[PDB]
Write a protein that binds this ligand. Structure first.
Ligand SMILES: Nc1ncnc2c1ncn2[C@@H]1O[C@H](COP(=O)(O)OP(=O)(O)OP(=O)(O)O)[C@@H](O)[C@H]1O
Ligand SMILES: Nc1ncnc2c1ncn2[C@@H]1O[C@H](COP(=O)(O)OP(=O)(O)OP(=O)(O)O)[C@@H](O)[C@H]1O
Ligand SMILES: Nc1ncnc2c1ncn2[C@@H]1O[C@H](COP(=O)(O)OP(=O)(O)O)[C@@H](O)[C@H]1O
Ligand SMILES: Nc1ncnc2c1ncn2[C@@H]1O[C@H](COP(=O)(O)OP(=O)(O)O)[C@@H](O)[C@H]1O
Lengths: 237, 1112, 188, 271
C-alpha cells in the first residue's frame, strides 16, 4: 500500500487496540517520524480525517491533531514533539514539525487547559527538562506569555525558589541553552521577589529555608546561594 | 552414558562386504556418522576380544542378514553378544533383511537354515541354545526388506536417514539461536528472491562492514540450499584473492576451481579454462552464495552471465561497494539495515550477560555502552564480549577507556575497507570524520572543492557504504568516524606537493601546540570541544609567538569562559577558510583578524556587539550564520560581499536595524530573521537579488518593509506575527510561491495585487489578520488554491466576485468575520467541500453559491431566510443553523437541516422540531429562560445544555443509537427526567449535575477498585457505570475526557475482556460535581467475582473519584 | 544429454545401476533416461539420435547382457559412433571376464549364442565385432576392485574429468589481435 | 582436578609468562590422558590464530576443525558448522588441553559449554590473564607458583653444568647468576644455557654484561606479553618498574591518580 494508506491503518490500529502506556509512549514517536518524513502528508491525512465522520473542525490540522491525541495520550504527544525536533529550522522536516506542534497547541487552547495542565503534560520528572528550549518554547506557545510560563513552572515546583534556581542553574549548563531566555526567567524570579521588597538577608533566608529538608531534586549549595543574594542585593535596593 | 562408536554393523563378509555394506558405509560417512570399521582394528591384538569390547561400546548395532549368515561362527557370536548387550545395557538394534525373509530365520529352515544346521554340527548345547534364542528374537525385530525396495540406493538412503534421525544428531544448527531478529531480513529477502520465477536472477547484499552480510548469507544458505540440485557457499572471497593481482587469469582460474570443487562434489578438480563452469552448470538448478566480493574480476571468474546456470538458479553476492553490483548489472539489491534499538540491546545483552536481558543494576551502564557502540552488530558483539565477566565498578571505570580508544577488532576490520580506497577518497574520508561530519553537501563542495573532486568522492564513498547522505547532509557512523579520528594522527594529507594533518581532540590535543619542535604549518584543521571547564587551557608563551595557517576551525566553546590565548592563537592565522565558533563569549572579533579569505562564518551563540567596527574585504564569502547572538546591536558594511548566498540572523533579538549595504548582496537567496523583537525597518534589497526564502516570523516591532522584491524565485515568504506592519512589498511573478502566511499579522490594510500572480500557491492563510479592509480583485487568478483560511478577520466588508474563477478550493473557513455583509452570488464552485461562516454577525443573506457543498455551518449569523434553490444541492452531510423564530416558513429547509442552536433567551418550546427528519444534534447555548423539552425527533446522536436555569421535565422517549446527553449545569431536573438521563441505553457517555453517586448503583467504592458479585450461571452481562471526579483546580471549561476500563478476577487472574474497553469524547465538559455514566459488556463466564478498574487517560487533567456500577 | 548409459535392466537396474545414478546425480551428471515401457524389440530412431549426441557412453556389462537384441543393437550403435564420431566409451565389467566378452564364451557366450539364433548373418557379425571391440577397450573390472562404492566413486570422478574437457578454450576468444603475435612468433 | 566426580569441570592455569604452564600441561597430559577415552592437546593457540581475524567465524571453524582432527585422529576432515564438536563428543570421556588461550573467541571455538563433553571429562586451559578465565566462568584456577630456591638451583645447574643437579667445581658465581635470574624457570634455563660449557674465567667476563642487560630470549617473550596492553597500562607498568616497585597501592594511587586511573590499571596488570 501507499504511505498514506499504511499510516492511516496504523493510526486506526493503535487507537483501536488500547495498548500499554509505555507501548504508546514508544509508538507515538515512530508515527511522528513517519509523519514528517515527506512534506505532503500532514495536509493530506488532515484532509482525510477532516472528511471522516465525527466532530467538525475548523481546519485539517485540527482534525489530525485531535486524532493523534485520541490515538496517543496528551503525555505521548508532548513527548514525541519534544523528542522529534529536527536540526535545521528551514528544512522541510522543520516545517512539518512546526505544523504538528502548532496544531497541538491550538487544540489544547481550544480545550481550555490551564498553564498547570500544560506543565504537567510536558512534565518528565527531571526538573531541568522544563528549561530545555525544545520544551520551553512549546510551553510558551501553549501559554502565550513567558511570564505565565515561568509562573506555571514555579508553581509546579510548589512555589519553591530553591528548586527553581537549582533547575535554572542546571539549565545554564546546557550546550544549546538560550542564555537570554534563561536569564529572563531568572530576572522574572528576581522581580517577583522585588515586588515583595524583601530585605537582602531576609531574601537569603527566604531562599535558604527551602534549602532545609521540608520536601527528590538536586538542592543548591551555599556558594551560589550567596551569589544569588549578591545578585539581588544592589539591583533592586 | 559413554559410547566409543555410534553404529556397529554385523554382517557376513563373504556376501555383503563387497557389494552393499560398502555403499551403506559410504552413505554413513556422508551424514556425519562414525561407524565402527573392523578393517581399522590395530594389528597384533586379539580380534575376538577387541571386537567384543567394541560391541558393548556401540550405541546402535545394525545386523545385515544374508543366506549364509549362519555359515560363520563370528556372525553368530557377535549377534548373541549384540542381543545380550541390548537386553542388558539398552543399545538399539536395527535389522536389514537383505534377500532373506525373517520367517525362515527363526525356523532355521531352508535358506540360512541349511547353513545353521551345517555350522551347529560341532558345538555344545549352550552355544546352540544361545544362538537359536538370539536368532529368533532378532527375527522378531521389524527392520527393512531388500525385496520391498525397487532400487538399492533409496533403501540405503532411508536406512542412513533413519539412523541419523534416531541418533538425535541434531543436524539443524543451534548456533542460529543466539542471533536476533533475522526474520525481518529473511522476509525482506524472500521478496527479492522469488524462487518460483524459474529465472537465473542475481541478487546483491550490500551494507557497511559489520552489519551482518556474512551471517545473513549463512542463515539464508542453511534455510534454502536444500531446495536446489547443487548448492555452494564461498566465504571471504576478498581475503583470499591476491592484493596486487599480478596475474589475473591464474587467480580467476583458481577461484573458479574452488567454486567448482565445492559446488560439484568433485573433491579435486584442476580447471584448464574459465569456461568449465558454463559448460557444466548449463542445465541445473543452482544456489550459489559469494561473500565479500571486492572487485569485478571475482565476479567474472565465478558468475559472468546468467546463461552459466540453469533455470531457477539463484546466486547471491554480498559486498560493500555498490559499484561492483551496478557494473555487473544486478538491479536486485537488498540494502541491509541496522537493527532496532531493542534488537540492538538484545544482541549486546546476549554477548555481554549471556541472556537477552541485563543483570540487575546494569541497565543504565549497559545502555551507555550500547549507545557508544553505535548500532553495528559487530560493535555490539565486540563491546559485549569485552565486558562479559566484569563487575559493575569495572564497567563504570572501563567505559572511559572504551570512549577514548577504538577496539582493535573493530579497528582492523574497518582498516581493511579503508585501505581499498583511492588516495583522494582517503583524504575526503578523513576530512569528513574530522570536521565536516554532519554538514551540507554543498558547503563541503564549496570548502574542499579546490583541493579535490568532492562530488565524485562523495558519490564513491556512498557507493562504498562509508557515508550516507540523507537530505543533503552527509552522515558517518559513530564507530567509523571514531576510527577516522585516530588515523588523523598517524596519517598525513598530500594535496599538491605539500603535506598536512588535522587536530581533532576534546582537550587533550593542545599540548602538541606546545611542542614548539615540529612544523605547525601542516595543521589546516582544528576541531575542539571545550565543554569541560571554564579554566583557561595551558599554552606556552612561545607557542603564542608562532603564527599558524589554520584554514578550517570548528570550536564548540561551550562554557561561560573566555579564551584569550585561543583567540590570540587562531585569529593570527593569515587565511582562514571557514570559521565556526559556538558560544564565543566575547564582545568583538579582534581587529588583527584578516578576513579576505573567508567562505563560511558561523557563530551559533555569541555575545558580539558591532563586530569588526569597520569596512573589510568580504570578497569571497558565501555563508553568514549569526544565530541566537542575543547581545548584538549592529552589523558591518556588507559592501563587497557580492558572493554572499545565505544570511541567517536567527533569533538575535537585540539587532535594532539592518544596514543599507544589503543592497550590494546581489546573490543573496536566504534572509532569516525568525525572532527580531527590536527591528524597525527592512531596507530595499535591489534588482538582481532574487531572494528565495524570506523568513520574518515574529518581528513584533518591524514597521516598514521594502516596496518591491523582484521575487522571481521566492519559494517561501513568512510573516507570521509581525503585529505592526502597514503595507506589504509588491511581487513581480512569484511563479513558485510554495508558502505564504500572515497568521495574526494585524494592522495590515491591503494586499499587493500581484498576489494573484502566484499560480501554484495551493494553501493560503490570513487567520487573525484583523484590520484588513478588502481582499484584492486579483484573488481569482491563483489556480490550485485549495485551502483558504480567514478567521476573525473583522473589517473585511466584502468578498471579490472573481472567486468563482478559483475552481479548486475545497474549504473556505471564514470564522468570526464580524463585519462581512455580502457574498458573491453568481458563482458555481465546481469542487467546494465546506463553508464555515460562524458568528458572521452581519452576514444577513443566505450564502448562495450553487455548489456541491457538503458541510455548511451558519451559526451566529443574521440570515433569517432560506432559498428554494437548495433542493438542487444533492448531498449535505452537515448543515447547521442558529435557530430563529421564522423557520416554520421554510419546510424545504426542515428535512435538510442537521443541527440547531437555541439562543440565550427563548421562552418557546418548539414542538414542530419533531417534524424535521434528520436532526443529528441539538444545542441549547444557554436558554436561561426555558422549562421543558418536546418529543425530539427519532434520529439524535447529540444533545447539549450548558448553563440553563430550568429543564424540569425532559419529555422525550428517544431510542436511536449511541446518544450523548450532556447537561453541564442544570440542577432543576425532575427525578423522572434525571432517571431517564441515567436509565437510557446508549453506547456513549452521559453527564448530569449530581453531588454523589445515585443509590441506583449499589456496588460502590472510592485506579480505584470496584468489587462486586453476580447472580447468573452463564450469560453475557451488561453493566451501567457511574463516576465522579476528584475535586481539584480543574479549569472552568475543560472540554475533553477519555476513560479506560480493566476488569479482572480474584479467584483466577484471567484478564476478562470488555468490548467497550474505552469511552472517549472531545467535547464533554470536565467539571467537579457531576455524574458521568456509561455502559459495558462482559462475556467471559467467570461466575462470582469481578473486579473493575476505571482509569482516566490524561491523569494530569482528570482523575476519577467516587465510583459505582450496576448490573442489568 | 550428458552420458548415455547402456545396461541390461533385469540384471543391474535394481542393484548397482541405482548407486551409479545416485553418484552421477550428486556429481552434477545428468545421464539419458529411459523406461522399460519405452523399449520395443528394436531400438528406434530416437534412441539412435540420443546415442549420437551423447558425446559419452557407458556400457555396463552383466552376465545376461548379450541376451537382449535391444542391448546388442545399442552396443553396436555405440561402437559405430565411437569409430566414426569422437564419442568416448567407458565400460564396466560387472563380475564378467573381459576375455569371455572377447571370445563370446562362458555363460555370457551361451546367452549370446542363444540370442543369435534366427538373426541374419550381418547382425551376428556386427554383434561379434562390437563385442570384441568393447572387450578390448580399457574400462573398470568389478572383480579387481575390493570396494564397490570406491569403484563407483572412481568411475564418477573419471566421467566428470572426461566431461569438463570437451570444449577447448571456447571462452575468452574475445581477445584481439593474437594472429599478428602468432605469425611473428612462428618465424622465431 | 578430582576426576572421580564425573562432571565436566573446566580448570584454568595462569601465571606470568615463563613459569611452565606449557610444561605443566604437557606433564599432566602425559600422566593422565590414558585414563580418558579420547584426548588431545593443542599448543600455542595464541600464536596459531589470525591476528587481524577479519572473519572470526572462519578462523573459529578451522580452530574447531584442528581440535577435532587432532583429537579423533580423524584424518583432518573438513567441518560443516560449529556445533559438530557437541554432536561427536557429548557422549564420551574427554581430556582436552588448550594451551596459551588469549581471548574469549578461542574458548567459544573449542569449549563453550560443559554440555559438549558429557559424563566425565576435563578441559584444562592455560592462559596469562585472569580476565579470560573469569569471563568464561571457570572458578577452578591454579595460580602457578615459583619453585623453591633449591629447586631453582637444581634447574639452573641442570641447564648450565650439563645434567649435574648440583654444581661442579667452584659453586660460587652460580648463585650470583641465579639471584640475577629471579625465579622464572625461563630465566633460569636461558641463563644456564648462556653459560653452558664455559670455564670459570669466561663465566666471569660473561657475568657483567649478563647483569646489565637481559638476554633477547627472555626479552622477546616479555615484549610480546607487554605489547598486548593498553597504552595507559604500559605507562603504569613503566612507572612501577622504574619508581614504585615495592610501595603501597594507596600511595601509588595518590601520587599517580591525576594521570593513569591507577585502580583500573593495577586491576588489569594483576589480572
Ligand atoms: N587375524 C587376522 N588377520 C588378518 N586378516 C584376517 C584375520 N582373521 C581373518 N582375517 C580375514 O577376514 C576374512 C574373513 O572375514 P569374515 O567374512 O569371517 O568376516 P565376518 O566374520 O563377517 O566379520 P564380522 O563378524 O565382524 O561381521 C578372511 O578372508 C581373512 O583374510
Ligand atoms: N579392458 C579392460 N579393462 C579393465 N581390466 C582389464 C581389461 N582387460 C583385461 N583386464 C584385466 O587384466 C587381467 C589379465 O591380465 P593379464 O595377465 O592378461 O596381463 P598381461 O596381458 O600379462 O599384461 P602385459 O601384456 O602387460 O604383460 C584380467 O584379470 C582383467 O581384470
Ligand atoms: N542478527 C544478528 N544477531 C546476532 N549477532 C549478529 C547478527 N548480525 C551480526 N551479528 C554478529 O556481528 C558480527 C559481524 O557480523 P558479520 O556477518 O561478520 O558482518 P559482515 O557482514 O561485515 O561480515 C558477527 O560475529 C555476528 O556474530
Ligand atoms: N619444573 C621445571 N623443571 C625444569 N625446567 C622447567 C620447569 N618448568 C619450566 N621449565 C623450563 O622453563 C621454560 C619455561 O617455558 P614455559 O614456562 O613452559 O612456557 P610458558 O611460559 O608458555 O608456560 C621451558 O622451556 C621449560 O623447559
Amino acid at each position: 500500500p501507499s504511505a498514506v494508506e499504511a499510516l492511516i491503518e496504523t493510526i486506526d490500529r493503535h487507537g483501536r487496540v488500547s495498548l500499554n502506556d509505555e507501548a504508546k509512549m514508544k509508538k507515538v514517536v515512530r508515527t511522528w517520524k513517519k509523519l514528517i518524513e515527506r512534506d505532503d502528508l500532514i495536509g493530506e491525512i488532515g484532509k482525510h480525517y477532516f472528511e471522516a465522520p465525527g466532530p467538525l473542525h475548523d481546519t485539517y490540522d485540527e482534525a489530525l491533531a485531535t486524532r493523534l491525541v485520541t490515538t496517543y495520550s496528551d503525555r505521548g504527544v508532548a513527548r514525541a514533539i519534544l523528542h522529534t525536533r529536527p536540526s535545521d529550522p528551514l528544512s522541510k522536516k522543520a516545517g512539518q514539525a512546526h505544523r504538528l506542534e502548532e496544531a497541538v497547541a491550538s487544540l489544547w487552547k481550544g480545550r481550555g487547559y490551564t498553564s498547570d495542565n500544560v506543565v504537567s503534560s510536558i512534565a518528565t520528572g527531571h526538573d531541568v527538562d522544563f528549561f530545555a528550549p525544545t520544551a520551553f518554547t512549546f510551553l510558551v506557545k501553549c501559554v502565550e506569555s513567558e511570564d505565565d510560563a515561568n509562573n506555571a513552572i514555579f508553581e509546579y515546583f510548589g512555589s519553591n525558589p530553591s528548586r527553581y534556581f537549582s533547575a535554572v542553574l542546571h539549565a545554564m549548563e546546557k550546550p544549546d541553552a538560550d542564555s537570554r531566555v534563561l536569564e529572563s526567567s531568572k530576572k522574572w524570579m528576581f522581580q517577583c521577589y522585588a515586588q515583595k521588597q524583601f530585605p537582602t538577608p531576609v531574601f537569603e533566608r527566604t531562599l535558604a529555608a527551602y534549602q532545609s529538608e521540608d520536601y527528590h531534586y538536586e538542592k543548591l549549595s551555599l556558594s551560589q546561594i550567596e551569589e544569588l543574594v549578591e545578585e539581588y542585593s544592589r539591583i533592586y535596593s | 552414558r559413554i559410547w566409543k562408536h555410534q553404529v556397529f554393523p554385523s554382517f557376513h563378509g563373504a556376501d555383503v562386504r563387497k557389494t552393499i555394506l560398502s555403499h551403506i558405509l559410504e552413505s554413513f560417512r556422508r551424514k556425519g556418522i562414525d561407524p565402527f570399521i573392523d578393517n581399522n582394528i590395530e594389528r597384533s591384538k586379539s580380534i575376538g576380544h577387541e571386537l567384543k569390547e567394541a560391541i558393548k561400546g556401540s550405541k546402535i548395532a545394525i545386523v545385515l542378514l544374508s543366506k549364509n549368515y549362519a555359515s560363520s561362527s563370528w556372525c553368530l557370536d557377535e549377534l548373541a553378544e549384540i542381543m545380550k548387550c541390548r537386553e542388558l545395557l539398552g543399545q538399539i538394534v536395527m535389522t536389514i533383511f537383505y534377500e532373506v525373509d525373517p520367517t525362515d530365520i527363526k525356523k532355521q529352515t531352508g535358506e540360512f537354515g541349511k547353513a545353521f544346521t551345517k555350522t551347529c554340527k560341532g558345538k555344545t548345547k549352550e552355544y546352540v541354545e544361545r544362538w537359536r534364542k538370539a536368532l529368533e528374537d532378532v527375527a522378531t525385530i521389524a527392520g527393512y526388506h531388500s525385496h520391498k525396495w525397487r532400487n538399492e540406493a533409496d533403501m540405503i538412503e532411508k536406512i542412513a536417514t533413519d539412523v541419523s534421525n534416531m541418533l538425535n544428531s541434531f543436524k539443524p544448527s543451534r548456533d542460529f539461536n543466539g542471533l536476533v531478529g533475522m526474520r525481518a531480513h529473511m522476509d525482506m529477502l524472500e521478496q527479492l528472491l522469488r524462487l518460483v520465477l524459474d529465472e537465473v536472477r542475481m541478487i546483491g547484499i550490500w551494507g557497511p562492514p559489520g552489519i551482518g552480510k556474512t551471517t545473513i548469507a549463512r542463515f539464508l544458505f542453511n534455510q534454502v540450499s536444500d531446495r536446489f540440485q547443487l548448492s555452494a557457499i564461498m566465504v571471504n572471497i576478498k581475503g583470499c584473492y591476491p592484493r596486487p593481482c599480478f596475474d589475473e587469469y591464474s587467480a580467476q582460474l583458481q577461484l573458479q576451481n574452488q567454486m567448482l570443487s565445492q559446488m560439484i562434489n568433485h573433491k579435486d578438480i584442476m580447471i584448464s579454462h574459465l569456461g568449465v563452469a558454463q559448460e557444466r552448470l548449463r542445465d541445473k538448478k543452482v544456489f550459489l552464495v559469494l561473500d565479500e566480493v571486492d572487485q569485478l574480476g571475482q565476479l567474472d571468474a565465478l558468475a559472468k552471465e546468467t546463461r552459466w546456470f540453469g533455470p531457477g538458479s539463484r546466486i547471491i553476492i554480498t559486498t560493500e561497494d555498490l559499484g561492483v553490483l551496478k557494473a555487473h548489472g544486478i538491479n536486485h539489491v537488498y540494502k541491509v539495515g541496522y537493527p532496532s534499538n531493542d534488537e540492538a540491546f538484545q544482541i549486546f545483552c546476549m554477548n555481554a550477560f549471556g541472556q537477552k536481558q541485563p543483570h540487575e543494576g546494569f541497565d543504565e551502564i549497559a545502555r551507555e555502552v550500547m549507545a557508544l557502540a553505535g548500532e553495528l552488530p559487530l560493535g555490539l558483539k565486540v563491546l559485549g564480549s569485552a565486558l562479559r565477566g566484569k563487575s559493575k565498578p569495572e564497567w563504570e571505570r572501563t567505559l572511559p577507556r572504551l570512549k577514548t580508544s577504538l577496539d582493535g577488532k573493530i579497528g582492523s576490520i574497518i582498516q581493511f575497507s579503508y585501505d581499498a580506497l583511492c588516495d583522494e577518497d582517503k583524504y575526503l574520508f578523513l576530512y569528513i570524520a574530522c570536521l565536516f561530519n554532519k554538514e551540507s553537501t554543498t558547503k563541503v563542495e564549496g570548502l574542499l572543492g579546490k583541493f579535490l573532486d568532492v562530488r565524485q568522492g562523495l558519490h564513491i564513498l556512498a557507493q562504498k557504504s562509508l557515508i550516507s547522505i540523507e537530505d543533503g547532509n552527509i552522515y558517518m557512523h559513530t564507530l567509523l568516524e571514531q576510527f577516522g579520528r585516530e588515523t588523523s594522527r598517524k596519517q598525513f594529507i598530500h594535496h599538491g606537493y605539500t603535506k598536512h594533518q588535522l587536530l581533532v581532540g576534546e582537550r587533550d590535543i593542545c599540548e602538541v601546540l606546545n611542542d614548539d619542535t615540529i612544523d605547525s604549518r601542516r595543521f589546516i584543521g582544528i576541531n575542539l570541544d571545550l565543554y569541560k571547564n571554564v579554566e583557561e587551557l595551558n599554552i606556552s608563551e612561545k607557542a603564542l609567538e608562532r603564527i599558524h595557517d589554520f584554514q578550517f576551525v570548528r570550536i564548540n566553546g561551550k562554557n561561560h569562559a573566555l579564551h584569550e590565548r585561543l583567540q590570540g592563537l587562531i585569529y593570527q592565522s593569515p587565511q582562514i577558510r571557514s570559521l565556526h565558533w559556538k558560544c564565543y563569549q566575547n564582545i568583538c572579533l579582534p581587529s588583527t583578524f584578516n578576513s579576505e579569505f573567508l567562505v563560511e562564518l558561523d557563530m551559533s551563540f555569541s555575545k558580539l556587539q558591532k563586530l569588526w567596527e569597520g569596512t573589510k574585504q568580504l570578497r569571497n564569502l558565501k555563508w553568514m550564520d549569526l544565530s541566537y547572538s542575543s547581545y548584538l546591536k549592529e552589523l558591518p558594511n556588507l559592501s563587497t560581499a557580492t558572493n554572499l548566498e545565505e544570511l541567517k540572523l536567527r533569533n538575535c533579538s537585540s539587532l535594532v536595524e539592518l544596514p543599507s549595504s544589503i543592497e550590494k548582496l546581489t546573490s543573496l537567496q536566504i534572509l532569516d530573521l525568525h525572532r527580531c523583537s527590536s527591528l524597525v525597518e527592512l531596507p530595499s534589497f535591489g534588482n538582481a537579488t532574487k531572494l528565495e526564502i524570506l523568513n520574518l516570523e515574529n518581528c513584533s516591532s518591524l514597521v516598514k518593509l521594502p516596496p518591491s522584491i523582484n521575487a522571481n524565485n521566492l519559494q517561501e515568504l513568512s510573516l507570521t506575527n509581525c503585529s505592526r506592519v502597514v503595507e506589504l512589498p509588491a511581487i513581480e511573478n512569484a511563479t513558485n510561491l510554495w508558502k505564504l502566511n500572515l497568521l495574526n499579522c494585524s494592522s495590515l490594510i491591503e494586499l499587493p495585487l500581484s498576489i494573484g500572480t502566484a499560480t501554484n500557491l495551493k494553501h493560503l492563510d490570513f487567520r487573525g489578520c484583523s484590520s484588513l479592509v478588502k481582499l484584492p480583485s486579483s484573488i481569482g487568478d491563483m489556480t490550485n488554491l485549495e485551502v483558504f483560511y480567514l478567521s476573525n478577520c473583522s473589517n473585511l466588508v466584502e468578498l471579490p466576485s472573481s472567486i468563482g474563477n478559483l475552481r479548486k478550493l475545497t474549504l473556505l473557513l471564514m470564522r468570526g468575520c464580524s463585519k462581512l455583509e455580502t457574498l458573491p452570488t453568481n458563482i458555481n464552485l465546481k469542487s467546494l467541500h465546506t463553508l464555515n461562516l460562524i458568528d458572521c454577525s452581519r452576514l444577513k443573506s443566505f450564502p448562495e453559491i450553487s455548489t456541491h457543498i457538503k458541510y455548511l455551518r451558519l451559526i451566529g449569523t443574521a440570515i433569517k431566510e432560506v432559498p428554494l434553490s437548495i433542493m438542487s444541492w444533492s448531498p449535505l452531510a452537515h448543515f447547521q443553523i442558529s435557530y430563529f423564530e421564522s423557520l416554520k416558513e421554510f419546510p424545504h429547509a426542515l428535512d435538510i437541516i442537521t443541527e440547531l442552536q437555541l439562543s440565550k433567551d427563548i421562552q418557546e418550546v418548539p414542538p414542530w422540531v419533531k417534524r424535521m427528519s434528520r436532526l443529528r444534534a441539538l444545542r441549547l447555548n444557554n436558554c436561561n429562560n426555558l422549562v421543558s423539552l418536546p418529543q425530539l425527533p427519532d434520529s439524535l446522536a447529540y444533545l447539549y445544555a450548558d448553563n440553563c436555569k430550568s429543564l424540569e421535565r425532559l419529555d422525550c422517549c428517544f431510542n436511536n443509537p449511541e446518544i450523548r446527553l450532556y447537561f453541564p449545569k442544570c440542577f432543576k431536573l425532575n427525578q423522572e427526567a434525571r432517571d431517564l438521563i441515567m436509565h437510557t441505553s446508549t453506547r456513549n457517555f452521559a453527564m448530569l449535575p449530581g453531588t454523589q453517586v445515585p443509590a441506583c448503583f449499589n456496588h460502590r467504592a472510592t485506579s480505584l477498585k470496584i468489587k462486586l458479585k453476580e447472580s447468573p450461571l452463564p450469560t453475557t452481562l451488561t453493566f451501567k457505570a457511574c463516576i465522579m471526579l476528584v475535586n481539584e483546580e480543574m479549569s472552568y471549561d475543560l472540554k475533553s475526557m477519555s476513560v479506560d476500563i480493566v476488569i479482572r478476577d480474584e479467584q483466577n487472574d484471567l484478564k476478562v475482556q470488555c468490548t467497550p474497553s474505552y469511552h472517549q469524547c472531545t467535547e464533554i465538559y470536565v467539571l467537579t460535581e457531576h455524574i458521568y455514566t456509561f455502559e459495558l459488556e462482559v462475556e467471559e463466564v467467570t461466575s462470582t467475582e469481578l473486579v473493575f478498574e476505571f482509569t482516566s487517560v490524561n491523569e494530569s487533567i482528570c482523575k476519577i473519584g467516587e465510583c459505582g456500577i450496576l448490573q442489568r
